[PDB]
Amino acid sequence: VNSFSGYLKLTDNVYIKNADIVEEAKKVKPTVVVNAANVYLKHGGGVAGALNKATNNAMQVESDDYIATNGPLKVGGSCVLSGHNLAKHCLHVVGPNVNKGEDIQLLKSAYENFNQHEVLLAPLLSAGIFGADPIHSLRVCVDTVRTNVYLAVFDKNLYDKLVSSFL
Ligand SMILES: C[C@H](SCC(=O)O)C(=O)N1CCNC1=O
């Protein structure tokens, strides 16, 4: 049994809800919240901007030290950092950004990072300002992630479209 409430069950392991990921993280304090990161961990907008703002910029400070030591992530890659006030840990995952011309086949590699964690609160990777089709992102999620993933869809209109179109 876990703390997550009000989710629709899509599959054995994937759940979805119309929710503000910061507000959901603040309520649940999950072991892992996933950030929609870029390779530079520059948390300017979308999920990264929101999450970072909710940490009062502590996520960005920690991220800048990580990059100064380790250099950029790979597209499709991830790192584990603090969850600050939102979660125990934040898994920063880099999905391909279609608005930068990155290969969408890298979306499956991105979701494979979730399999290193038994339970996660996450957004749909590569959706929103990353330019990919959220319907596609949900399909790749379901077909890739085997651990228990609780997806927070920001937009109610999009949430309803994702549920109604789910095969
Ligand atoms: C990846 C999403 S796109 C819209 C969606 O999930 O419907 C995004 O930009 N944001 C901002 C805050 N929470 C989010 O998920």
Coordinates of C-alpha atoms and ligand atoms in Angstrom, one line a residue:
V1 CA 0.0 0.0 0.0
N2 CA 1.2 3.6 -0.7
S3 CA 0.1 7.3 -0.1
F4 CA -0.9 8.1 -3.7
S5 CA -4.6 9.1 -3.9
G6 CA -7.1 9.7 -6.7
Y7 CA -5.1 8.0 -9.6
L8 CA -6.7 6.1 -12.4
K9 CA -5.0 2.7 -12.9
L10 CA -3.9 2.3 -16.6
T11 CA -1.9 -1.0 -16.2
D12 CA -0.5 -3.3 -13.5
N13 CA 2.2 -0.7 -12.7
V14 CA 1.2 2.7 -14.3
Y15 CA -1.2 5.2 -12.7
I16 CA -2.3 8.7 -13.9
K17 CA -3.9 11.8 -12.3
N18 CA -4.7 15.4 -13.3
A19 CA -2.3 17.0 -10.8
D20 CA 0.2 19.8 -10.3
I21 CA 3.5 17.8 -9.7
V22 CA 4.8 20.4 -7.1
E23 CA 1.5 20.2 -5.2
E24 CA 1.5 16.4 -5.4
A25 CA 5.1 16.1 -4.3
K26 CA 4.4 18.5 -1.4
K27 CA 1.5 16.3 -0.2
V28 CA 3.0 12.8 -0.7
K29 CA 6.7 13.4 -0.1
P30 CA 7.5 10.5 -2.4
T31 CA 10.8 8.6 -2.2
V32 CA 11.4 9.8 -5.8
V33 CA 10.1 12.7 -7.9
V34 CA 11.2 12.8 -11.5
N35 CA 12.3 16.1 -13.0
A36 CA 11.9 16.8 -16.8
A37 CA 15.6 17.9 -17.0
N38 CA 17.9 19.1 -19.7
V39 CA 21.5 18.0 -20.0
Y40 CA 22.8 21.2 -18.3
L41 CA 20.3 20.9 -15.4
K42 CA 19.2 24.4 -16.2
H43 CA 15.7 24.4 -14.6
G44 CA 14.2 27.4 -16.4
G45 CA 10.6 26.2 -17.4
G46 CA 8.0 23.4 -17.5
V47 CA 8.4 20.8 -14.7
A48 CA 12.1 21.9 -14.0
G49 CA 11.1 25.6 -13.6
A50 CA 8.2 24.7 -11.3
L51 CA 10.0 22.1 -9.2
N52 CA 13.1 24.4 -8.8
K53 CA 10.9 27.4 -7.9
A54 CA 9.2 25.2 -5.2
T55 CA 12.7 24.5 -3.7
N56 CA 13.5 28.3 -3.5
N57 CA 16.2 27.7 -6.1
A58 CA 18.1 25.1 -3.9
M59 CA 17.6 22.5 -6.7
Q60 CA 19.4 24.9 -9.1
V61 CA 22.3 25.5 -6.7
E62 CA 22.8 21.8 -6.1
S63 CA 22.5 21.1 -9.9
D64 CA 25.1 23.8 -10.8
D65 CA 27.6 22.1 -8.4
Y66 CA 26.7 18.7 -10.0
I67 CA 27.4 20.0 -13.5
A68 CA 30.6 21.8 -12.5
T69 CA 32.0 18.4 -11.2
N70 CA 30.5 15.9 -13.7
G71 CA 29.7 17.8 -16.9
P72 CA 26.4 17.5 -18.7
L73 CA 24.1 14.5 -18.7
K74 CA 23.4 12.6 -21.9
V75 CA 20.0 12.9 -23.7
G76 CA 18.2 9.8 -22.4
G77 CA 20.3 9.8 -19.2
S78 CA 19.6 10.8 -15.6
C79 CA 21.2 11.5 -12.2
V80 CA 19.9 11.2 -8.7
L81 CA 20.0 14.4 -6.6
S82 CA 18.3 15.7 -3.5
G83 CA 14.5 16.0 -3.5
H84 CA 14.8 19.0 -1.1
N85 CA 11.5 19.9 0.4
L86 CA 9.5 17.9 -2.2
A87 CA 10.7 14.3 -2.0
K88 CA 13.6 12.2 -0.6
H89 CA 15.3 12.2 -4.0
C90 CA 14.9 13.9 -7.4
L91 CA 15.6 11.7 -10.4
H92 CA 16.6 14.3 -13.1
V93 CA 15.8 12.5 -16.4
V94 CA 16.6 14.0 -19.9
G95 CA 14.0 13.2 -22.5
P96 CA 14.7 14.3 -26.1
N97 CA 13.6 17.9 -26.8
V98 CA 11.9 17.9 -30.2
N99 CA 12.2 21.8 -30.3
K100 CA 16.1 21.2 -30.3
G101 CA 15.8 18.4 -33.0
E102 CA 16.7 15.3 -30.7
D103 CA 15.9 11.7 -31.7
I104 CA 12.5 10.6 -30.3
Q105 CA 13.8 7.0 -30.1
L106 CA 15.8 8.3 -27.1
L107 CA 12.5 8.6 -25.2
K108 CA 12.5 4.8 -24.5
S109 CA 16.1 5.1 -23.1
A110 CA 14.9 8.1 -20.9
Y111 CA 12.1 6.0 -19.4
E112 CA 14.4 3.1 -18.7
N113 CA 15.9 5.2 -15.9
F114 CA 12.6 4.8 -14.0
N115 CA 13.2 1.0 -13.7
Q116 CA 16.1 1.7 -11.2
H117 CA 13.4 2.9 -8.6
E118 CA 10.6 0.8 -7.2
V119 CA 8.1 3.7 -7.0
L120 CA 8.1 7.2 -8.6
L121 CA 6.0 10.3 -9.0
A122 CA 6.7 11.6 -12.6
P123 CA 5.6 13.8 -15.5
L124 CA 5.3 12.5 -19.0
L125 CA 8.8 12.8 -20.5
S126 CA 9.3 14.8 -23.7
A127 CA 5.8 16.3 -23.5
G128 CA 4.9 20.1 -23.1
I129 CA 7.8 22.4 -24.2
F130 CA 10.0 19.3 -25.1
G131 CA 7.8 19.1 -28.2
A132 CA 6.7 15.4 -28.3
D133 CA 3.2 14.1 -28.5
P134 CA 2.1 13.3 -24.9
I135 CA 0.0 10.3 -26.2
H136 CA 3.2 8.8 -27.6
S137 CA 5.1 9.6 -24.3
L138 CA 2.4 7.7 -22.3
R139 CA 2.6 4.7 -24.7
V140 CA 6.4 4.6 -24.3
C141 CA 6.1 4.9 -20.5
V142 CA 3.6 1.9 -20.3
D143 CA 5.7 -0.2 -22.7
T144 CA 9.1 0.6 -20.9
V145 CA 8.6 1.2 -17.2
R146 CA 8.1 -1.9 -15.1
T147 CA 8.3 -0.3 -11.7
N148 CA 5.3 1.6 -10.2
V149 CA 4.9 5.0 -11.7
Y150 CA 2.4 7.7 -10.7
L151 CA 2.0 10.1 -13.6
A152 CA 0.9 13.7 -12.9
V153 CA -0.6 15.3 -16.0
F154 CA -0.6 19.2 -15.6
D155 CA -3.4 20.0 -18.1
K156 CA -7.0 18.7 -17.4
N157 CA -7.8 18.9 -21.1
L158 CA -4.8 16.8 -21.9
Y159 CA -5.4 14.4 -19.0
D160 CA -8.9 13.6 -20.4
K161 CA -7.5 13.1 -23.9
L162 CA -4.8 10.7 -22.6
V163 CA -7.3 8.6 -20.7
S164 CA -9.9 8.5 -23.5
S165 CA -7.3 7.5 -26.1
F166 CA -5.4 5.0 -24.0
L167 CA -5.3 1.5 -25.5
Ligands
LIG1 C1 5.4 18.4 -18.9 C2 4.2 19.3 -18.6 S1 3.1 19.5 -20.0 C3 1.4 19.6 -19.6 C4 0.9 18.3 -18.9 O1 1.4 17.5 -18.1 O2 -0.3 18.3 -19.2 C5 4.6 20.7 -17.9 O3 5.0 21.6 -18.5 N1 4.3 20.9 -16.6 C6 4.4 22.1 -15.9 C7 4.0 21.9 -14.5 N2 3.6 20.5 -14.4 C8 3.8 19.9 -15.7 O4 3.6 18.8 -16.0

